[PDB]
Amino acid sequence: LNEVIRYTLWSVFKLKDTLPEDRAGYADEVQELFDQLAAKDVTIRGTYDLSGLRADADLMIWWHAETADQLQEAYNLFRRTKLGRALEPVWSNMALHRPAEFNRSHIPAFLADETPRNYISVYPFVRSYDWYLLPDEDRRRMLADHGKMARGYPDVRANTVASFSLGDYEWILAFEADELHRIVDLMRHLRGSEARRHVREEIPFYTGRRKDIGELVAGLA
Amino acid sequence: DLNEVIRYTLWSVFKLKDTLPEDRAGYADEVQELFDQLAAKDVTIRGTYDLSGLRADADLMIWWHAETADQLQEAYNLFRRTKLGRALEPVWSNMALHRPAEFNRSHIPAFLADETPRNYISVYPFVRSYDWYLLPDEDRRRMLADHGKMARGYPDVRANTVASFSLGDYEWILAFEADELHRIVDLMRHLRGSEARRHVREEIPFYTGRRKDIGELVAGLA
Amino acid sequence: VIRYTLWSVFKLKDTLPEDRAGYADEVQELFDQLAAKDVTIRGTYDLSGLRADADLMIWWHAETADQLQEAYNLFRRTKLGRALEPVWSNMALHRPAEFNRSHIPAFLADETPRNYISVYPFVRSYDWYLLPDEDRRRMLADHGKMARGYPDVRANTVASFSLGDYEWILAFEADELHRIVDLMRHLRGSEARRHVREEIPFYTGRRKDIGELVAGLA
Amino acid sequence: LNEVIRYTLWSVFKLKDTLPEDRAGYADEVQELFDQLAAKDVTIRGTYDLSGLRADADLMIWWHAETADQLQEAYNLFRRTKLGRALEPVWSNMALHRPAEFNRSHIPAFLADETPRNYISVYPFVRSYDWYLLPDEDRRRMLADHGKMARGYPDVRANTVASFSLGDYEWILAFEADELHRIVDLMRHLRGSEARRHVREEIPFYTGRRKDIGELVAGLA
Amino acid sequence: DLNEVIRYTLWSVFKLKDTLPEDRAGYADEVQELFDQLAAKDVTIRGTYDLSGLRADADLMIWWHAETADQLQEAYNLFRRTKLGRALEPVWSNMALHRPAEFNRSHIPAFLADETPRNYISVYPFVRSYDWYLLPDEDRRRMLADHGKMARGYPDVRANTVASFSLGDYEWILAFEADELHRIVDLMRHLRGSEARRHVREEIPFYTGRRKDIGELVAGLA
């Protein structure tokens, strides 16, 4: 299973303005595309309401597929929908699942049968310049201690997917949880790991409520 | 006790797209109607704030809080449909939620304690050093205690430091309330003398302004 | 005691009209009504060409932040204001100096405005205010005496903690522009340059009557 | 071959909204211009689909000529096509092959005229302030040691081209391979090189699929 | 003695809002007329440069200098009123002023010594390290001398490094002219070997282009 090929693309959009007072068929059209996409092996793990938690983000789409190419096609197809034409691209990064350095049983929840949860917290990651230059023992230790420190939070599901030379980052992280504050306390608790001493960048956070494209479109302004 | 409530707090900053119209008759009223309706659910609107002139790309800040984030999201998009909302671009909207303090569980944000909101506010995000939370518990304790001790001469300035890890780009959203603006000024200058200042990576943007009823605010905006 | 001071920077949306008959008078009218209310318009400055995203600055002060907020919105309603984009607007408030209390901003001591200005924000190092008082006393005394040879450059350094993103806002006015330049360069030799995190953006420009300023702008 | 004066320019664009549904002339009119520029010595090594992998890029052009002025003319002409009047410029940096400091048979894989592969990732590069002040031995060793580390990845072609004072950066980098995941593993593997301690900037990344102009015009939204 | 002259130099960079019309009418000529009128008032226009393609956000540069800042501001606003001006938006406009070099009073920017503009320019701002001006004089004097020596193989590249403290965000504006673009590239990479490289905080954006008469500039542009 450390041998699948799967590309994950999280892509974030913001309303150009408000959606129209009459938005009949906006939701349905997008759902239509989401199904014929699901025909091909392009799965839409979730769409997400990001309104109000960020001023420049309103909608997120999590899709994954077997080639980067299929995602690119999906992205452009969405932008042709009547909804995508009322949105502006904001941030859209792709990552690719690779075997973990040490613990080869570490697997992202979207490749481990796990259910999508109510809330998501997505964000890129970039380590210090000498993270990967460290004596393997030091990095395996900090990476293991850091996983211990989170064993109290199995109600928060992790996706931690390599992204080197797919964009500006080293990793794209996604956290799934039914209770939003459990994500908060996880981050807060993990500020205690020694790994925190080897971080260059973890911005921007996009955090939202997983929703059906029907009520998502109705919720948006 | 209050350290066991779940209260999400949201600060939403807007700027005029350009100017309100000359006749702005329905604008404040329609917004007050929405605020009244949000108050029927437990969506409380602690205040609206005039930020114009104190920052070139901010004119209006709504402070609201509620039991789920979803109600804030709902309230937010509902605001953006009002006539006032359609004259405004979003600029900065960040959510936080009270978590128990680490050492002193009697530290409670003012909005949680149902304190009275004051005439002026300064809201700003906050990010600690990378090694702040890794420092041995004794050293973080006496820097957190010493800094609150330095604030004793300013009881008129009411803190609202709230956790925000993974709600957005920051660790903490801070909101200070006082009836005289220069006292916020004087508190920060004085707190520059606390040793915790050596454990700061980020603390901008600042959104400072005057608390106003929605009718007066909509009248005085360009 | 208690004077708030505001520097408001705008840039053209495009150009002004060819026929700009009303524009300067309308603004001068409002400046006159504000001076009645004790909202002082200390100057308007032409910033064009010296920065691509800035064309005019207004320096106004008053007894409360609120009067300035009100003045700022009134100005954005004029014809000239409606032809502008807000770029950078930051307030400060004088507080008595930490060490030498004769040291006060020029515009409180009522000195005349000079021909040119350069306005910029300031943020000191994280540990500047944690230093022993005698160290900060020495560095402030020394940086100030290095400036003895530039008595033609008037300072206005004004605390701005919690009003916006900065700790101080700085305004230098001199009759010859190059004198500001040489002052800056010479002070790069003060030890206090070791305790700086941020000192941009600079807005530098020519003091002009509002009439002359409207006509010269693109 | 370290004597050839060759300027190479990568030009990134993004859609202003979307192309029209009726895009008949679009892909053809561009392909004409490419034919003319190749009649001069303006080689167009590839067009690339960048969409979805970045929210603010959709199309990259990799061109190169004997003179920088030729590329400037090519650029303004392309911006005159119907496809070009449909794009905002996003990022366009030029570089120029100079001999290597130590190993003069390291030469960009594009003036050793090779084959453009399916996938490219392009990004700028700026070294630490003191990298060039290091004793020649130390910089020699690190560049050599980092070259060894990429032996396992010979299906990935390196172009790394000096850029000093043609723009903000010190080099432009382009990596091309037929299997996208191989660029990913190469970057990750190379984070173990000592030269990682002498890096100040390496972004934005532009990664995408080489495509023929007609196929690319049809794919974009 | 050129050290006692006062000469303000301004580089003004613009990008196209979209693309120029097909019918470029007297676009080139209206601008050339204004340059001539400015030339009459001792507003020298050393060069106009094609930036396009080498930077996605710049197509045109104007290098003009004069005896007062004010004259350059007027030139600038007048240029913006031309038909070409109305088809551009400003990107980056910085002014500088020659002041006597710290140690070697013979170092003089090329334009002030009335040398000939070459085919290619690269312009960029510069900001030194915080302690740069605080190093003991002989450390800084040695480092600048050595950096001079390292440039001796490049006399075909002319330097115009000029003080800009307080005129904008920087310490110096630098402008290098050469007849062959690759000589600039090579000088830069060669000077990375100077010790002064350890005392650098900022040196972007770079605007690098080809010197062109207004007419063919306006014609080659998109």
Side-chain angles (χ1 to χ4, degrees), chain B residues 24-80:
Chain B
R24 49 192 82 185
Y27 284 62
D29 276 6
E30 184 199 12
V31 171
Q32 190 63 61
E33 164 85 282
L34 170 61
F35 289 171
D36 292 342
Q37 278 160 12
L38 293 162
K41 319 88 159 74
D42 202 18
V43 180
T44 126
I45 288 72
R46 190 173 173 72
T48 55
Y49 299 87
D50 200 335
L51 312 170
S52 62
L54 271 95
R55 187 171 198 110
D57 61 331
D59 290 311
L60 190 152
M61 175 173 78
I62 305 176
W63 189 358
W64 29 23
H65 58 93
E67 188 165 22
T68 72
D70 303 56
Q71 294 159 277
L72 299 177
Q73 295 186 277
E74 197 199 343
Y76 178 91
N77 291 96
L78 282 189
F79 175 77
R80 289 192 24 80

Side-chain angles (χ1 to χ4, degrees), chain A residues 46 57 67 79 92-93 172-173 202:
Chain A
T67 55
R79 303 208 53 222
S92 182
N93 280 70
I172 314 291
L173 287 45
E202 48 203 312

Side-chain angles (χ1 to χ4, degrees), chain C residues 14-15 46 48-52 116 118 177-178 180-182 184-185 188-189 196 202 204 206 216-218, chain E residues 8 10 17 70 73 77 80-81 86 90-93 97 99-100 102 130 133-134 165-169 171:
Chain C
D14 284 275
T15 53
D46 187 333
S48 61
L50 275 91
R51 194 163 189 117
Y116 302 99
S118 55
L177 188 48
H178 72 271
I180 312 182
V181 177
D182 298 327
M184 275 330 114
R185 182 189 184 191
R188 297 281 135 121
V196 184
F202 277 77
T204 305
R206 179 74 217 266
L217 284 185
Chain E
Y8 293 86
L10 169 69
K17 10 167 152 186
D70 307 54
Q73 306 186 258
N77 283 289
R80 296 204 65 241
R81 290 205 265 244
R86 299 190 135 70
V91 165
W92 185 94
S93 198
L97 174 78
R99 327 290 314 116
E102 173 175 9
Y130 283 118
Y133 306 90
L134 291 167
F165 314 84
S166 248
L167 300 187
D169 295 349
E171 307 190 339

Side-chain angles (χ1 to χ4, degrees), chain B residues 123-205:
Chain B
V123 179
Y124 60 100
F126 205 83
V127 172
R128 285 282 169 196
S129 66
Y130 281 120
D131 69 337
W132 175 247
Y133 308 94
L134 294 170
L135 290 168
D137 286 51
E138 184 36 40
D139 302 331
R140 194 163 58 267
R141 188 202 325 260
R142 58 106 167 70
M143 285 193 287
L144 282 176
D146 275 352
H147 111 108
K149 212 207 161 230
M150 295 192 62
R152 302 264 217 82
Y154 297 86
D156 45 318
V157 179
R158 315 303 302 149
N160 291 260
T161 87
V162 192
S164 69
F165 314 90
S166 78
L167 297 192
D169 301 355
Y170 313 106
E171 307 179 329
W172 308 91
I173 308 325
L174 312 194
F176 296 100
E177 298 175 291
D179 270 348
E180 283 198 298
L181 181 55
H182 72 272
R183 297 288 288 161
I184 318 204
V185 173
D186 282 346
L187 166 64
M188 314 293 309
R189 184 150 138 69
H190 182 66
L191 275 187
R192 285 303 202 265
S194 63
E195 288 283 334
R197 292 306 298 171
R198 311 181 175 275
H199 297 276
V200 182
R201 285 183 294 121
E202 186 187 9
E203 61 195 325
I204 61 202

Side-chain angles (χ1 to χ4, degrees), chain A residues 54 119 185 191 207 220-221, chain B residues 70 77 81 99 166 169 171:
Chain A
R54 224 203 170 77
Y119 296 106
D185 295 316
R191 285 289 123 98
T207 286
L220 299 197
Chain B
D70 303 56
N77 291 96
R81 294 181 191 158
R99 306 318 291 151
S166 78
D169 301 355
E171 307 179 329

